[PDB]
Design a binder for this molecule. Structure first.
Ligand code: HEM
Ligand SMILES: [C-]#N
Length: 147
Protein backbone atom coordinates (compact mmCIF):
# COMPACT_ATOMS: atom_id res chain seq x y z
CA UNK A 1 0.00 0.00 0.00
CA UNK A 2 1.14 3.53 -0.87
CA UNK A 3 0.75 6.53 1.45
CA UNK A 4 -0.74 9.78 0.06
CA UNK A 5 2.77 11.28 0.04
CA UNK A 6 4.22 8.24 -1.82
CA UNK A 7 1.38 8.30 -4.40
CA UNK A 8 2.12 12.00 -4.94
CA UNK A 9 5.88 11.69 -5.53
CA UNK A 10 5.25 8.66 -7.86
CA UNK A 11 2.63 10.61 -9.92
CA UNK A 12 4.87 13.70 -9.98
CA UNK A 13 8.15 12.00 -11.05
CA UNK A 14 6.30 9.81 -13.62
CA UNK A 15 5.85 13.00 -15.73
CA UNK A 16 9.62 13.27 -16.02
CA UNK A 17 10.17 9.46 -16.37
CA UNK A 18 7.56 9.26 -19.18
CA UNK A 19 9.35 12.10 -21.03
CA UNK A 20 7.99 12.58 -24.52
CA UNK A 21 8.04 8.82 -25.35
CA UNK A 22 5.83 7.41 -22.56
CA UNK A 23 8.87 5.86 -20.87
CA UNK A 24 9.82 3.80 -23.98
CA UNK A 25 13.52 4.68 -23.57
CA UNK A 26 13.49 3.69 -19.87
CA UNK A 27 11.96 0.34 -20.87
CA UNK A 28 14.60 -0.37 -23.50
CA UNK A 29 17.37 0.40 -20.99
CA UNK A 30 15.74 -1.61 -18.14
CA UNK A 31 15.32 -4.75 -20.22
CA UNK A 32 18.69 -4.47 -21.99
CA UNK A 33 20.60 -4.06 -18.66
CA UNK A 34 18.52 -6.85 -17.03
CA UNK A 35 19.18 -9.45 -19.77
CA UNK A 36 22.87 -8.42 -20.05
CA UNK A 37 23.25 -9.12 -16.34
CA UNK A 38 21.12 -12.28 -16.26
CA UNK A 39 21.65 -14.14 -19.55
CA UNK A 40 19.54 -16.99 -18.23
CA UNK A 41 16.47 -14.72 -18.34
CA UNK A 42 16.50 -14.38 -22.17
CA UNK A 43 14.89 -17.85 -22.46
CA UNK A 44 12.07 -17.00 -19.97
CA UNK A 45 11.07 -14.15 -22.30
CA UNK A 46 11.68 -16.12 -25.52
CA UNK A 47 14.36 -13.63 -26.67
CA UNK A 48 17.63 -14.60 -28.34
CA UNK A 49 19.57 -12.24 -26.08
CA UNK A 50 19.77 -8.60 -25.01
CA UNK A 51 20.06 -7.39 -28.65
CA UNK A 52 16.77 -9.07 -29.73
CA UNK A 53 14.42 -6.38 -31.26
CA UNK A 54 11.69 -7.66 -28.95
CA UNK A 55 13.35 -6.18 -25.78
CA UNK A 56 12.88 -2.56 -26.96
CA UNK A 57 9.30 -3.53 -27.96
CA UNK A 58 8.38 -5.18 -24.69
CA UNK A 59 10.21 -2.48 -22.68
CA UNK A 60 7.88 0.17 -24.20
CA UNK A 61 4.74 -1.93 -23.43
CA UNK A 62 5.78 -2.43 -19.79
CA UNK A 63 6.46 1.25 -19.19
CA UNK A 64 3.19 2.20 -20.92
CA UNK A 65 1.37 -0.22 -18.57
CA UNK A 66 3.16 1.24 -15.50
CA UNK A 67 1.89 4.64 -16.73
CA UNK A 68 -1.79 3.51 -16.61
CA UNK A 69 -1.11 1.86 -13.18
CA UNK A 70 0.29 5.27 -12.03
CA UNK A 71 -2.89 7.03 -13.28
CA UNK A 72 -5.03 4.65 -11.11
CA UNK A 73 -2.99 4.61 -7.85
CA UNK A 74 -5.71 6.57 -6.02
CA UNK A 75 -8.04 3.60 -6.55
CA UNK A 76 -6.10 0.62 -5.27
CA UNK A 77 -8.77 -1.98 -6.11
CA UNK A 78 -8.83 -0.67 -9.70
CA UNK A 79 -5.04 -0.77 -10.14
CA UNK A 80 -4.73 -4.29 -8.64
CA UNK A 81 -7.65 -5.65 -10.70
CA UNK A 82 -6.12 -4.46 -13.98
CA UNK A 83 -2.60 -5.66 -12.99
CA UNK A 84 -4.09 -9.07 -12.03
CA UNK A 85 -5.56 -9.29 -15.57
CA UNK A 86 -2.11 -8.60 -17.04
CA UNK A 87 -0.80 -11.34 -14.70
CA UNK A 88 -3.40 -13.86 -15.88
CA UNK A 89 -2.12 -13.24 -19.46
CA UNK A 90 1.44 -14.03 -18.38
CA UNK A 91 0.49 -17.67 -17.74
CA UNK A 92 0.78 -18.14 -21.50
CA UNK A 93 3.85 -15.88 -22.04
CA UNK A 94 7.51 -16.70 -22.81
CA UNK A 95 8.56 -20.15 -21.60
CA UNK A 96 5.22 -20.24 -19.65
CA UNK A 97 7.08 -20.82 -16.42
CA UNK A 98 7.45 -17.21 -15.25
CA UNK A 99 8.26 -17.34 -11.55
CA UNK A 100 7.61 -14.84 -8.76
CA UNK A 101 11.34 -14.62 -7.88
CA UNK A 102 12.09 -13.07 -11.29
CA UNK A 103 10.29 -9.81 -10.43
CA UNK A 104 12.58 -8.46 -7.69
CA UNK A 105 15.75 -8.26 -9.97
CA UNK A 106 13.57 -6.68 -12.71
CA UNK A 107 12.59 -3.96 -10.19
CA UNK A 108 16.18 -2.99 -9.46
CA UNK A 109 16.84 -2.62 -13.21
CA UNK A 110 13.72 -0.46 -13.68
CA UNK A 111 14.63 1.90 -10.84
CA UNK A 112 18.15 2.33 -12.24
CA UNK A 113 16.81 3.02 -15.76
CA UNK A 114 14.40 5.63 -14.27
CA UNK A 115 17.26 7.29 -12.35
CA UNK A 116 19.42 7.28 -15.48
CA UNK A 117 16.72 9.34 -17.19
CA UNK A 118 15.57 11.71 -14.43
CA UNK A 119 18.94 12.16 -12.61
CA UNK A 120 18.76 14.05 -9.30
CA UNK A 121 14.93 14.11 -9.29
CA UNK A 122 15.11 10.39 -8.42
CA UNK A 123 16.16 11.17 -4.87
CA UNK A 124 15.85 8.85 -1.81
CA UNK A 125 12.16 9.72 -1.27
CA UNK A 126 11.38 9.07 -4.96
CA UNK A 127 13.27 5.72 -4.88
CA UNK A 128 11.47 4.49 -1.76
CA UNK A 129 8.07 5.44 -3.19
CA UNK A 130 8.82 3.80 -6.54
CA UNK A 131 10.13 0.68 -4.74
CA UNK A 132 6.82 0.62 -2.86
CA UNK A 133 4.86 1.26 -6.08
CA UNK A 134 6.82 -1.46 -7.96
CA UNK A 135 6.09 -3.84 -5.02
CA UNK A 136 2.30 -3.36 -5.40
CA UNK A 137 2.16 -3.40 -9.23
CA UNK A 138 4.30 -6.56 -9.62
CA UNK A 139 2.63 -8.09 -6.48
CA UNK A 140 -0.77 -7.69 -8.14
CA UNK A 141 0.60 -9.07 -11.44
CA UNK A 142 2.03 -12.11 -9.56
CA UNK A 143 -1.42 -12.69 -7.92
CA UNK A 144 -2.96 -12.88 -11.38
CA UNK A 145 -0.13 -15.14 -12.56
CA UNK A 146 -0.70 -17.51 -9.61
CA UNK A 147 -4.51 -17.44 -9.69
C1 HEM B 1 10.50 -11.03 -15.19
C2 HEM B 1 9.05 -11.01 -15.30
C3 HEM B 1 8.35 -10.95 -16.50
C4 HEM B 1 8.42 -11.79 -17.58
C5 HEM B 1 9.30 -13.01 -17.79
C6 HEM B 1 7.48 -11.28 -18.54
C7 HEM B 1 7.33 -11.82 -19.80
C8 HEM B 1 6.56 -11.28 -20.80
C9 HEM B 1 6.54 -11.79 -22.15
C10 HEM B 1 7.32 -12.98 -22.67
C11 HEM B 1 5.70 -10.99 -22.85
C12 HEM B 1 5.45 -11.04 -24.34
C13 HEM B 1 4.13 -11.67 -24.69
C14 HEM B 1 3.85 -11.75 -26.17
O1 HEM B 1 4.64 -12.36 -26.90
O2 HEM B 1 2.83 -11.21 -26.59
C15 HEM B 1 5.19 -10.00 -21.91
C16 HEM B 1 4.28 -9.02 -22.23
C17 HEM B 1 3.86 -8.03 -21.38
N1 HEM B 1 4.31 -7.87 -20.10
FE1 HEM B 1 5.55 -9.01 -19.09
N2 HEM B 1 6.85 -10.13 -18.11
C18 HEM B 1 7.36 -9.93 -16.84
C19 HEM B 1 7.08 -8.82 -16.07
C20 HEM B 1 6.23 -7.78 -16.42
C21 HEM B 1 5.91 -6.66 -15.55
C22 HEM B 1 6.58 -6.28 -14.23
C23 HEM B 1 4.92 -5.96 -16.15
C24 HEM B 1 4.21 -4.93 -15.52
C25 HEM B 1 3.76 -3.70 -16.14
C26 HEM B 1 4.68 -6.63 -17.43
C27 HEM B 1 3.82 -6.19 -18.41
C28 HEM B 1 3.66 -6.74 -19.66
C29 HEM B 1 2.82 -6.17 -20.68
C30 HEM B 1 2.00 -4.90 -20.57
C31 HEM B 1 2.93 -6.99 -21.75
C32 HEM B 1 2.22 -6.85 -23.08
C33 HEM B 1 1.07 -7.84 -23.29
C34 HEM B 1 -0.05 -7.73 -22.27
O3 HEM B 1 -0.53 -6.63 -22.02
O4 HEM B 1 -0.44 -8.74 -21.71
N3 HEM B 1 5.50 -7.74 -17.59
N4 HEM B 1 5.77 -10.15 -20.67
C1 LIG C 1 7.04 -8.13 -19.65
N1 LIG C 1 7.58 -7.68 -20.56
Amino acid sequence: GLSAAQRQVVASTWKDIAGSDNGAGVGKECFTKFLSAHHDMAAVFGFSGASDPGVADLGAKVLAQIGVAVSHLGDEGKMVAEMKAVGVRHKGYGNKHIKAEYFEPLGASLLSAMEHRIGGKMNAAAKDAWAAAYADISGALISGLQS
